[PDB]
Design a binder for this molecule. Structure first.
Ligand SMILES: Nc1ccc2nc(N)nc(O)c2c1
Ligand SMILES: Nc1ccc2nc(N)nc(O)c2c1
Ligand SMILES: [Zn+2]
Ligand SMILES: [Zn+2]
Lengths: 364, 364
């Protein structure tokens, strides 16, 4: 396969369906990427993650740089070999988590203390790109400065401007490393909060630099679905049409459906909540103690073929690890089934109808 | 298959190897039974438990009667259907756990408060047998009164005597329930602490009543391996030779090898400790942070084929659920491989040699 090749096979309105070909495998879009925090998708073996239908997973520069360490993972042979996942891996730049879990900020980057050992680290565009290389990331995310919501026009502009400067530094760092530039891909991140003029400026700067994909950052940070959808309405069209559009940190089923309707191709997002086509349910609720039905009536995942709500209800309330294993496999499988239905409906020119039917039942 | 049929295929000294045929499947002996606490073998899907080589698992009357409840499990279709394990299941009587986790004792039974909700329960030989029936247990354990170590001759005798009276009540309760007597098996439990005359009295009383199997209870309660082996030396020969001998709660690898050398056919027993043919290791130790080798050099389990000590080291220190999943699958697989080597060596008349080689390396 090539280093990177995004091809759109079908369209309906702003929605698109296709594939991203990379050296380690093919990614079907729209795609949902399970998230791996500490070099593991919570409670699932990689083979199980693959079994649910995932084509790619997400890794975090922040968590990994702290534990077990980027240099260590490199010495060990890379993240893929380390955790046992041989398909594509997209790694975030770390910036987002540093401002949420660990901080001295400057134009050079960010310095902070680990929320684990209390040690210090100076994350910068250059160091972020290097760490993702050490991990062996397939899709590298530019290092940016997220803008907290709400944000004043002035502050949103300053952060967007810095991010574009950092985007240029990320691009140059990536291209200067021969092995990384020839085998991996680099995605730029659009910022600008909820302001259209800033989003336009960010998109233009990003397209001028040139990236393999474009992510819409700064959303899903407390603005609500209505506002998010409004921002996506004018933001996504600003990005290059022939490259993937990645909405960072968005995962609620209805959010995904609405985002795909607005041009998004990639998603990622991180208990007793189980998704069903009839809306989510909390398995801990007493009404499920003797319910012999599976989590969802049509879901084809292994959990729904073998265990009842009553059993999983018992496991979760008992704090048993198998409870988490089963709930997680079903939920990730549900998400993949959702992406499959989306891809098929777009391919058959009936996505709008699918969106309508989905919402009618999901919120009924 | 028949309700119950134990056949010995080979022998060497006091060691035996053979099979126990039951309606739900065949059990190869010597056998190791993984333990299921709350209707689940910690962090493993039943298929994974089976994959490691287990022919039967153990369930607990105490934990299940508290959560989710015996009556509830029955209404739900039985423990097998509930947890998804269709092979044989041996259930303990609950008495042991009540005196360790939850108490008013009498000749009629024991009353106690749950260490969960604080509710009350009156476990008796009759209620214990009934609960195991409600669960759908294949091998039912008689309800006894364990003797704390150390125990005075007087107290050991009183408890042994009560246990034999309770053993008779267990037998009658079992036989009176048509469905249970025709489809399940009942094991009696020998008591008597470390005293030979009491063990002999217990064995005689048990054989007089008649059981499908005989367990050696009251050991592995703080007496040490030397003392335990000394008690087994004269205790096991007292039991009927043509029925299975079950050593309750004994699981350290060296303990199992020594017990089989003394006539035991069945075992069961309940972190970063990983077993290896070179002795156990604690994966949390810093010396494993960059060790690319598998947990054990020859173990054929899935964990050892796919992940390194370095990765599992990371997972466990990070508190990740996959860490527990992988460590548990390997350990249970190790135990099953140990039982297989024991069965094969006995069948080939070279068990004594195997025991010698095992110890030499395990403790080297
Ligand atoms: N809602 C999100 C989630 C993750 C993000 N990661 C980066 N690097 N930047 C953003 O703006 C994000 C927004
Ligand atoms: N070491 C053990 C473990 C479990 C036991 N269970 C019962 N019912 N009775 C004993 O004596 C036990 C001893
Ligand atoms: Zn499911
Ligand atoms: Zn292993």
């Amino acid at each position: 396969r090539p280093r990177f090749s995004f091809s759109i096979a079908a369209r309906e309105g702003k929605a698109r369906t296709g594939t991203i070909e990379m050296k380690r495998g093919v990614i079907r879009t729209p795609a949902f990427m399970p998230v791996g925090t500490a070099a593991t998708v919570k409670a699932l073996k990689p083979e199980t993650v693959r079994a649910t239908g995932a084509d790619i997973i997400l890794g975090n520069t922040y968590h990994l740089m702290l534990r077990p360490g980027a240099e260590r993972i490199a010495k060990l042979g890379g993240l893929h070999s380390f955790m046992g996942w041989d398909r594509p891996i997209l790694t975030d730049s770390g910036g987002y988590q540093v401002m949420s879990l660990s901080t001295k900020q400057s134009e050079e980057g960010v310095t902070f203390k680990s929320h684990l050992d209390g040690s210090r680290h100076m994350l910068s565009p250059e160091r972020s790109i290097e760490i993702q290389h050490l991990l062996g990331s397939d899709i590298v995310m530019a290092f940016d400065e997220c803008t907290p919501y709400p944000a004043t026009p002035s502050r949103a502009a300053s952060s967007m401007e810095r991010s574009m400067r950092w985007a240029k530094r990320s691009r140059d760092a990536f291209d200067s490393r021969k092995e990384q530039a020839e085998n991996a891909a680099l995605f730029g991140i659009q910022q600008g909060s909820v302001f259209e003029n800033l989003r336009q400026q960010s998109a233009d700067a990003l397209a001028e630099i040139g990236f393999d994909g474009y992510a819409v950052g700064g959303l899903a940070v407390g603005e609500g679905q209505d506002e998010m959808f409004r921002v996506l309405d004018f933001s996504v069209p600003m990005l290059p049409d022939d490259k993937p559009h990645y909405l960072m940190g968005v995962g609620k089923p209805d959010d995904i459906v609405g985002a795909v309707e607005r041009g998004i191709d990639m998603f990622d997002c991180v208990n007793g909540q189980a998704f069903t086509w009839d809306g989510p349910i909390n398995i801990r609720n007493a009404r499920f103690s003797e319910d012999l039905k599976p989590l969802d009536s049509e879901c084809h995942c292994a959990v729904c073929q073998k265990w009842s709500r009553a059993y999983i209800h018992h496991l979760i309330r008992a704090g048993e690890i198998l409870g988490a294993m089963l709930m997680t496999e079903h939920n990730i499988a549900f998400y993949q089934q959702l992406m499959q239905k989306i891809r098929d409906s777009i391919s058959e020119g009936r996505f709008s109808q699918f969106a309508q039917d989905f919402r009618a039942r999901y919120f009924a």
